[PDB]
Amino acid sequence: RDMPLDSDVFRVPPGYNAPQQVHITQGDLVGRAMIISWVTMDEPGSSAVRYWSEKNGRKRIAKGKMSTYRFFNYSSGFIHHTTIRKLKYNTKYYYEVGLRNTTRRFSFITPPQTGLDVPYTFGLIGDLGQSFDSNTTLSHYELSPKKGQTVLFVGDLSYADRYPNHDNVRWDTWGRFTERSVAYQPWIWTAGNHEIEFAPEINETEPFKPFSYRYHVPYEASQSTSPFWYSIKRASAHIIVLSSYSAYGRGTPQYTWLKKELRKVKRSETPWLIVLMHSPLYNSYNHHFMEGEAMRTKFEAWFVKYKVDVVFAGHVHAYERSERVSNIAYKITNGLCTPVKDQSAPVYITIGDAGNYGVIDSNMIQPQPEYSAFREASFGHGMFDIKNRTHAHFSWNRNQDGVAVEADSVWFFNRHWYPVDDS
Amino acid sequence: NRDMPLDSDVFRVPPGYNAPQQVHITQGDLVGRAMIISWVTMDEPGSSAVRYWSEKNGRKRIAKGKMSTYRFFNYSSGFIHHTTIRKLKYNTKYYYEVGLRNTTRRFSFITPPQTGLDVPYTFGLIGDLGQSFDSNTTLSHYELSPKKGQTVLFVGDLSYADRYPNHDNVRWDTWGRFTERSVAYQPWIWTAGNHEIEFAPEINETEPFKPFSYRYHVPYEASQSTSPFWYSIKRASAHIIVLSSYSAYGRGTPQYTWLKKELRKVKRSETPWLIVLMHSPLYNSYNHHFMEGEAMRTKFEAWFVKYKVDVVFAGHVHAYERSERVSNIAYKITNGLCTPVKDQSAPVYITIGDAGNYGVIDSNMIQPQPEYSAFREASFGHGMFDIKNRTHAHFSWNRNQDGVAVEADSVWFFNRHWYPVDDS
Amino acid sequence: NRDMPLDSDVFRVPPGYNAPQQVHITQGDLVGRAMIISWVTMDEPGSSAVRYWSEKNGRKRIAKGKMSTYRFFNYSSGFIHHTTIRKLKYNTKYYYEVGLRNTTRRFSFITPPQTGLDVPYTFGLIGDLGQSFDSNTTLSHYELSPKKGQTVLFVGDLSYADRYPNHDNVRWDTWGRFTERSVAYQPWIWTAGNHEIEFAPEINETEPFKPFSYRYHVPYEASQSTSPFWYSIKRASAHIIVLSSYSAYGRGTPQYTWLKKELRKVKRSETPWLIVLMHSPLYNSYNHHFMEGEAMRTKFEAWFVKYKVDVVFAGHVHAYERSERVSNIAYKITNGLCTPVKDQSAPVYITIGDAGNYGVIDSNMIQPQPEYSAFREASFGHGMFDIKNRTHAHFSWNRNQDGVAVEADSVWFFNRHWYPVDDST
Amino acid sequence: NRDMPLDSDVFRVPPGYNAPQQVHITQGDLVGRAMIISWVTMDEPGSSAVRYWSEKNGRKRIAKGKMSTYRFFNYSSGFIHHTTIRKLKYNTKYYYEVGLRNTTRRFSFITPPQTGLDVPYTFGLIGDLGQSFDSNTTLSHYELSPKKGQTVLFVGDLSYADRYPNHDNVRWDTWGRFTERSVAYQPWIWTAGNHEIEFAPEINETEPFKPFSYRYHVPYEASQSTSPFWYSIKRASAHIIVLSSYSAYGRGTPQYTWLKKELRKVKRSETPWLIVLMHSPLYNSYNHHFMEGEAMRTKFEAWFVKYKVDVVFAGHVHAYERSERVSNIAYKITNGLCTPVKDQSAPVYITIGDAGNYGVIDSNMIQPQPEYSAFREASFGHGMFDIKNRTHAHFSWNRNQDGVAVEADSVWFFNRHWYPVDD
Ligand SMILES: *[C@@H]1O[C@H](CO)[C@@H](O[C@@H]2O[C@H](CO)[C@@H](O[C@@H]3O[C@H](CO[C@H]4O[C@H](CO)[C@@H](O)[C@H](O)[C@@H]4O)[C@@H](O)[C@H](O[C@H]4O[C@H](CO)[C@@H](O)[C@H](O)[C@@H]4O)[C@@H]3O)[C@H](O)[C@H]2NC(C)=O)[C@H](O[C@@H]2O[C@@H](C)[C@@H](O)[C@@H](O)[C@@H]2O)[C@H]1NC(C)=O
Ligand SMILES: *[C@@H]1O[C@H](CO)[C@@H](O[C@@H]2O[C@H](CO)[C@@H](O[C@@H]3O[C@H](CO)[C@@H](O)[C@H](O)[C@@H]3O)[C@H](O)[C@H]2NC(C)=O)[C@H](O[C@@H]2O[C@@H](C)[C@@H](O)[C@@H](O)[C@@H]2O)[C@H]1NC(C)=O
Ligand SMILES: *[C@@H]1O[C@H](CO)[C@@H](O[C@@H]2O[C@H](CO)[C@@H](O[C@@H]3O[C@H](CO)[C@@H](O)[C@H](O)[C@@H]3O)[C@H](O)[C@H]2NC(C)=O)[C@H](O[C@@H]2O[C@@H](C)[C@@H](O)[C@@H](O)[C@@H]2O)[C@H]1NC(C)=O
Ligand SMILES: *[C@@H]1O[C@H](CO)[C@@H](O[C@@H]2O[C@H](CO)[C@@H](O)[C@H](O)[C@H]2NC(C)=O)[C@H](O[C@@H]2O[C@@H](C)[C@@H](O)[C@@H](O)[C@@H]2O)[C@H]1NC(C)=O
Ligand SMILES: *[C@@H]1O[C@H](CO)[C@@H](O[C@@H]2O[C@H](CO)[C@@H](O)[C@H](O)[C@H]2NC(C)=O)[C@H](O[C@@H]2O[C@@H](C)[C@@H](O)[C@@H](O)[C@@H]2O)[C@H]1NC(C)=O
Ligand SMILES: CCC/C=C\CC/C=C\C=C\CO[C@@H](c1cccc2ccccc12)P(=O)(O)O
Ligand SMILES: *[C@@H]1O[C@H](CO)[C@@H](O)[C@H](O)[C@H]1NC(C)=O
Ligand SMILES: *[C@@H]1O[C@H](CO)[C@@H](O)[C@H](O)[C@H]1NC(C)=O
Ligand SMILES: *[C@@H]1O[C@H](CO)[C@@H](O)[C@H](O)[C@H]1NC(C)=O
Ligand SMILES: *[C@@H]1O[C@H](CO)[C@@H](O)[C@H](O)[C@H]1NC(C)=O
Ligand SMILES: [Fe+3]
Ligand SMILES: [Fe+3]
Ligand SMILES: [Fe+3]
Ligand SMILES: [Fe+3]
Ligand code: NA
Ligand code: NA
Ligand code: NA
Ligand code: NA
Ligand code: NA
Ligand SMILES: [Zn+2]
Ligand SMILES: [Zn+2]
Ligand SMILES: [Zn+2]
Ligand SMILES: [Zn+2]
Fold this sequence. Notes:
The first copy, chain A, is an alpha+beta fold. Chain A has five helices and 25 strands.
């Protein structure tokens, strides 16, 4: 059910060495920078980006870096990453890539300065892939009347590793497929299990290597030492990105980094505290049941202590929304191992249902446990619409429905500013 | 601070120009016919060649290895040598010499017998050794033990150098000179503890395990691991699996992938004793680090029960603990089944992190003793796991405050694959 | 453009999934007991293992090598294998196979005799081969020669890939497949010429010799050299020194220092024939590249006369020339002694860069012929240096326009150490 | 052995925890608007940031650089810093501070005037300095010169550390601390000499120039060179070309290709003084190293005469010599033209390698003095190249055994392009 190589979403931009696979993401901690990325195939080309605002018209030049990789018998094109900085808040910019031979032009809109009551709309996509179901989801997100401004991506991008020798041409087609969205607004990248690409059978043993070459993130801005975990702030949201498939024992980099990062969170500057990871801590589907238990034993209590608002995960090819629960009182011999209602706790949302290679996960644990509010095996995407410091509106759109229909929808009440029960 | 001062006898430098120091050895292949020979020269790079011969044939041979150096903050290492001797005869005494160019030092070892069903072998068990005065006593009790251990299973936390300002790596060098009087003559099987992480971004040192990994090499490619921090070796009648508590082990990760495949390769008709080393215990009823093992346990415990692992050795708690054979693999979030139960199909869990560290014992325990815990005591000591044949092994625990020959705890193991009768 | 087109037969891809191509061997040690097996696989990395066994005995062994890859501008290479077979027996035919995982191909070679005073041996001389039609004829003439070459001495300028846009490295791949029919069966000894430099900052390739050095390894550590671009080998009764015209050679440089110590190690009582290979000729009365060899001459000529080198072979000039034994080492800036004189202690200097290149011959000569030049002609062809015993070696030049058994020029060398007698024509 | 012992005053270590030592500066760009600031910290890495401000305005700014280390045999370097200050103002005195994190130290320099046809400027000429007692005298004589030199052209052989056992690299550190009293306040232009090669395969140091290149950076990319060992700069009314006696220079090599194109760039109406620096002299009538420079001469002498180089400076020979204006470029093997002739498009060749090395002079001279030799003497000292304007520059030679204001040799240079009078 994967879209064939000659499909229109995979068409190659014309002209000698025309930039392709253009994508952007937030380039700094607070919103005043952007990482511009693209691939040229005919020759290395230039790493310069030319950009200007609608307001100023003044054209400046940023210069970045070019890298390549091989994977088994595949040889990549020339990958460019360039960071434009010191931009102005709430402003439309133009930028151009391919300055040596074939120039292409795009644009983006910076976010507002971070603040307590700054509204903002986030799209939620996981496990996208490049099947036909993938294409419908992206169309539905594009036509959403709520107008997403940034995508939080919860992992599993191209599913290129399902192909023989992980055929990396399928990374390239995915790069051209998603451009019509991610060249114009930032997507925030989370690493999933399909990015690992651990294949000693063909002497490819560097974890995450193709993903890490193609998708860069601003991980030093939060003083992280790896791209696989980091945070950013945008409008009124503090977003914490975690890596299910890196080390998180006591004393490791990721564990040490998270414990320090939660202490920097300021709820009167960014009241919406959002965590992303690939593998769900709370999951009542049969597929991948209880895989999140390990990370859950390390981090769940931290999430409650700091009153995290919501945790988004993918990995399960379906949709689920948890009640506000915690399961943090167990001590081996006390028998306290059942989740309980907890108004300091986040809501757990699984949203890894954007299409993958065309398969849904429909088997569920019966009966639905108390901790599960809503679950359904349908393709689609989510929208997390922040109105202000007390209220945010979440809605789930199905591919079989109209682009304006919401099959699930709920108001989030802020854990710090308005911790009402929101069942 | 009960650390031995820098001018202690155990820290003396071997005299002579560019005299090799910190000499240590470990198994260098899958099945016992190779040895990794390691040492440090401090005056100049020197030769990485090892001269060696068997007592049986007396033919001097030469093996060439590699030299490396590292830096950590404002410390610069000496010249680190690693050399693999190969194609050794089983059950044979060998001599070896390092420092062939200026000052030469000679040592010896004995290869194991070939892997087989009823091949006896005595493994020492040492965890969280350190370089305090208690560490020296433990080491003396081991080398003086009438059971005579042939190989040390080391469950992590080596030098404790990371407790010093800037992780003063001089305390790695001292520890190497202290342990030489044992590890130069018999292999130690290295596990990576949390004191080896040395993650210190405040001084721009962000590569985990860097000092440990430059100084202590392991034969990880022989079991097709891709990392020195998990791997497998076979010796006599044992299959030893080494794990990394502070690497990734999520489903799909390198370590998870390797362990799933490796348990399937275990041939209990060749090595009947399946033994797992890791730093952080899965079962532990002391207050200190209580439940830090929960994460790894949810990932790997059902596998250990499935493949009838005989015993799991851990450290990290500074004390001794021996569990019953228990499991806790029936939990399903909402079914309330979360109390360990007796399970004669499960390994024994032993904590043996009490060789000395920096002079501090972990004496606070959860009371009353839980049903899963068989024996526990807060005393310094070491362990011995003495294989007799395919069905019987004998474990003993020796306390620093007893005579070298006094066993304070001891128990017979009945092999989970060849003889699974209640040994509780 | 007289370069052979891409679909020529000499460029045909060996059939079969991941079949090895561009197979070539060279001597892999100082004395002749080793051989470096090199080849490229185009579909996936494959195995670096070489299976090999001797024709008479036949116990099959495996040797394991290494694989590497490189990029040049927007060209990406396939998978390059280099594998050293050691501890061979002298004067023995060996079989060997490559491609052990998927498509295997089998070849063979004959180890040299053990080094010794009177060991006969036959060396081909080829320079500036390229891949034109003229190139094909010369290689044809060499492989058909009655004298039966057992090793090619190659004085530099291999593929001429750098004449193509962006140095189209595909033209390295074809040249490998074209030369395979000789170099997979007998070692070629490699010298680095000015077309291997491939210095092209305009496309950000600033590492001299990158494609050449990835594809052709040499046993350079065996003579205590620190660079592949200069080294020494012994083979039968010859001691061969390979130098680098386009590397440093000032006093105190690595190459200078290495040649100095290497000339001391030469023992003419063990290997009587002392042979030097370099790309740019020290003595050259053709007009193309006239006097480029002067800088290296001022450094090394006196050393050649001192050590009584028998012969110096060079290329670069797309024609043939053979000098008289002469020297020019008495100049002191103001004493006026700047003319070459006859010197029975000096080597013969032979330019042999006429194997074909891209089809052009250098016919502009300085006139009249200088007294330092014995014979010269602007024709394509190749040479043979045919060693008989410790006193006699026969050099001959075969033209492409002649029968393969015809020598258009031919001279008997009398050994400078064992028969130090005037041997001029 | 007349080298200064380790406890000499000139080798004292700046006091205080991790105080910068071995501070040295050089030109950081092509035209004079930038400066490379270099120093060593011995107790811990420290910061590579430099603080600098003009004496005029005084707006303080920070430039960030790069720390590196090396090993040589059993030696382990300290922490070496290189930091480029850019966009400086012409003809302006600046202050700079290094060591910001712990012990700070403060120095100053004066940027040159803008390049131009008639800018005056005074260059000191020092060669083969080393660290003998004679070395200390020459550096005193240069510092005290009434001519007041503003930038040193250093023609190679720096520390002579390679004469010690295993090239005791401590002797680089001592030399660094000794020369600091001049080179921290005004730039020195580095040329590589044979004592910088440090090729010692018998202790597996086989990378040519390794300690030298770590310790002394040059702005080589600003002239499109691919190597630090050949490069060019412009300062005031001079165009300075630095060449590498012990790198490759055959036809088609990188340095050959660079020099050929670089000479095509010189413009004598912007910079009328065309100066070439190299270590091994092309004209030398002393016995030590006689005719060592023939090889480079066969490749480059004709180019020097074709582009009318004013003066060529070299060292290597521990003495002084000034040549007549001659060339020896007509030789064609059989035509017999091998004697040098007066040539008024040729440069003057000056050997200035007599600053002290380790205390030995080269006194054995070829007799009688050849015609191409104007003046020669075997005594320690230094030179001065004092440019008055586009037609005139004045060269003088000061000997260590004279007062700091006596010139034992002296001559006017008439510019080859603007005023080619027989001199
Ligand atoms: C695999 O290893 C295990 C561990 O070593 C083996 O188990 C041991 O087996 C040995 C026998 O080989 C046992 O030792 C023997 O014990 C008997 C009984 O001792 C008790 O009762 C005596 C009165 O009869 C009393 O005097 C004594 O103090 C004790 O309380 C001894 O009688 C015996 O000594 C006499 O016989 C030997 C043999 O000829 C003579 O040499 C002596 O001179 C004496 O006259 C001997 O010491 C030992 O108890 C076992 N250990 C354990 C922990 O069970 C195992 O052996 C196998 O399994 C055991 C369970 C038995 O079935 C053995 O028969 C059997 O071989 C090893 N497996 C194999 C296949 O070998
Ligand atoms: C070393 O190698 C040289 C070159 O091959 C030998 O010289 C050659 O010796 C051949 C005899 O072995 C000569 O061939 C004969 O010529 C005669 C007269 O024309 C014929 O009747 C006869 O049938 C052969 O064809 C050959 O001419 C000669 N070549 C040269 C260039 O001189 C040399 O042999 C030694 O020197 C020569 C001059 C003779 O005296 C030989 O007998 C003598 O042994 C070889 N050296 C040794 C020690 O064998
Ligand atoms: C690596 O960096 C550490 C941390 O700075 C160095 O240790 C420090 O050395 C300083 C000496 O420069 C000490 O400061 C002095 O302490 C003495 C003793 O009280 C006082 O009299 C004096 O006035 C200074 O304050 C500093 O206390 C010390 N800090 C720590 C945490 O140990 C280390 O230096 C090495 O160790 C010290 C103890 C001395 O022996 C040094 O000379 C020695 O090199 C640095 N190591 C290296 C190899 O550079
Ligand atoms: C934050 O946004 C919320 C959603 O837009 C606001 O609540 C909405 O307020 C409307 C008129 O103020 C009312 O008609 C809507 O029904 C209501 N929606 C919901 C889900 O309550 C909210 O306004 C404040 O909070 C609510 C609870 C009322 O008390 C309003 O009168 C308040 O002004 C916004 N909060 C703030 C602080 O702006
Ligand atoms: C460039 O500087 C030269 C050195 O000072 C000038 O020559 C000097 O001019 C002085 C007049 O101010 C005169 O007294 C000095 O004797 C003379 N010095 C020498 C060594 O000749 C030079 O001046 C021009 O050129 C010379 C040849 C004379 O014709 C002067 O009168 C000229 O002004 C300066 N050149 C220029 C273009 O300014
Ligand atoms: C618990 C997370 C890490 C916090 C600090 C790191 C350890 C710093 C110094 C050494 C302490 C003693 O060592 C033990 C230990 C290790 C780790 C922590 C402890 C805390 C208290 C006592 C002993 C703790 P251990 O790892 O050897 O079993
Ligand atoms: C993908 O979706 C877009 C927009 O809905 C549509 O125009 C395009 O034809 C689709 N392509 C495929 C291959 O489904
Ligand atoms: C280096 O080696 C020399 C030669 O023996 C020795 O004298 C010197 O002290 C050594 N220095 C260091 C820093 O190891
Ligand atoms: C350590 O133990 C050994 C052996 O028991 C003893 O000889 C030595 O003196 C002890 N040293 C210290 C510092 O305790
Ligand atoms: C280092 O070079 C020396 C010089 O002889 C040599 O003995 C030694 O083996 C070399 N080490 C290598 C190539 O690893
Ligand atoms: Fe998925
Ligand atoms: Fe510990
Ligand atoms: Fe050529
Ligand atoms: Fe000198
Ligand atoms: Na842990
Ligand atoms: Na032996
Ligand atoms: Na997992
Ligand atoms: Na040349
Ligand atoms: Na020289
Ligand atoms: Zn997944
Ligand atoms: Zn621990
Ligand atoms: Zn050429
Ligand atoms: Zn010199």
